[PDB]
């Protein structure tokens, strides 16, 4: 009854077991009955929360339709419709349909790939009902149910523990702590209950039980657990607008202002001249319709879709095009540590024998991959007796079992199992029969077993112990040295202590091993260094990112020592750096955080709110901040961050949803490939924008000048259509599809205040436009001095304009490198397009049918050569400017 008010983990931790049971009306021994479970499920529902609420396809279509450039395109389409411009409206609607169709197809494919990659099995739960243990699905849980936890079990819901022996729960998923947290059934004081990791009497949903047996009572199901509050916070923060979208909006506003300026200028010119108002107004609106280019969205969408497809081919799914743009223009990259920077898989890396030999173990994870190297020599099997004895002691005295690269047991024991597997001694456990077992406990801090060989049962009993050095060395009396048994002296003990301290100073966890006939007279074997190593290929990637001008910071909820060791190993920590805890982050506000966070680089013991605050503080300075992670605090960080990078294997569903790209193989080379692709996309967009703006400005100026005085429209409809095809067609697409240069990807990241339209680009556009219009006006001046209108004037102007457009496109192929630096062939599509256009022009000016259709005349070889030479000043001037800029650069 009482509708079963949900108890938070805080209050459940504060109140004792009896009070919680009385409040929840839960039977600890006999469990719940079916009728009560159904009654409680009728209100609280199932143990699920809605993830990725997907709207129908029409909503996504409308969302892709909603773009300021698209709105400008429809505005231009309707204003052309009111003046009976059918061709312009058809072109605009075709461009809009193509852009939205491509965007919808790409997003649908990305969503399908995300759904297929993330395969989820319905988890089960062990609970007692009516007094007999029966296995239910995790969804059927209701508050008050008594849940039994075993080794390897995944916690389905929040539990108030009342029975637990030697329980160890891996909370790296929720808190990021690599070391499993011991659980105690005693109530916790309110003073020490502030932190999540300090709640040792609460079992959190989604965590993995690594050791011990537990019995708890459900206190929260669904969105009321600790995995529901983080989800609520996730759907409470607005992702910030991408710099690509801001640049697109700024460019659209600039284009609208430019169109308004030109129509006002034409209005003023017409008023000054004395022409009629209505025809001049119609001409102004027609010129405005001719402005606002329509191919920019097509080119941008095509280039970004090609980049997305390339990223997919590189094992990386991208939800949005501005997402990959944000990754390309990233400035600061942050990282969770436990999970994306480290394998979250304890592995033995250093072995020290009783004889003094040092052994290095390579490889990461719970897999047989890896080799043990002693003095530059690979050791396999029983090659080295000293290392082999340690491996045998760690393998026989082991209860952890790894199946299909999944560890069931203590991570430290899994490290020893993996080390034994790397040496080819995986089956050493089956060769002995464990007669007497002493289990590992916090008080004793050691574990010893007694066993006899399967086929050598007549051999005397041998006992192996593992644990802390201090406890193991008490039962050790002799040591082995080069196959000889010598009594353990005080000097040897001091040497072992020195080695243990040296290994601990490097962040390695020291475990002692021994073997002998009976407890107390064991022989010391050696020490093994167990650490949680970083993922392969991460140190080089971090070094490359640091050398590229991108700062790398670490935010994690683990201990200070582990974070410091990991950062020092990866190069993010030194002897002069500083570390800031979560309490220090919560201490100051705004200004002091802004002074502190950029200087520091290591954050330890950080709550999800602390990570969100750090992300917001980094965003306040204006730098683009990136973060990668696999947890829930990481998920809320990616939600607060502009760019979200997740892991497709070790990550969670919440982390994957909160992110914006998912990594399949858990690599960073893919991340810098995305950065390079984004830089190339930005360069191509800049070049295409410059070329199209210059061409549009020149064409509009020429049309306005022609209409202004006397001769009305000295060009036929077919010539105008072919001109419109050339500038905004295959040449434009080929310019927008320009590949990635090897020099544009070795540059410092673009600043936040940098925009596409710069003063240099504007000056180059103006210079090219004035040169083109001067050449065309000189040609038309010679033809008007001829004082005859016999299609020769029209065809000469048509060819001059076509050649000027081609040379402008060739000049705008690159903005930094010269013409003879990227290759004449380069894009095969560009060569095909220019060859097709030039043969079409030759047929138009040569074939009598096409000549009559286009109203052209015959041109001799000398005239064609002179035209080719004259319409080359744009390319020559642009190359001279580029060469001057290049000189001065280095100079
Ligand atoms: F998984 Be991270 F260390 F928060
Ligand atoms: Mg993590």
Curated annotation (Swiss-Prot):
Residues 1-56, 110-248, 299-685, 737-756, 815-827 are cytoplasmic. PROSITE patterns: ATPASE_E1_E2. Its main location: Golgi. This is Calcium-transporting ATPase type 2C member 1. GO terms for molecular function: ATP binding; ATP hydrolysis activity; calcium ion binding; manganese ion binding; metal ion binding; P-type calcium transporter activity; P-type manganese transporter activity. Ca(2+) binds at residues 289-290, 292, 294, 724, 728. InterPro entries: ATPase_P-typ_cation-transptr_C (IPR006068), ATPase_P-typ_cation-transptr_N (IPR004014), ATPase_P-typ_cyto_dom_N (IPR023299), ATPase_P-typ_P_site (IPR018303), ATPase_P-typ_TM_dom_sf (IPR023298), ATPase_P-typ_transduc_dom_A_sf (IPR008250), HAD-like_sf (IPR036412), HAD_sf (IPR023214). It is a multi-pass membrane protein. It holds the Pfam family Cation_ATPase. Changing residue 397 to R: In HHD; decreases protein expression.
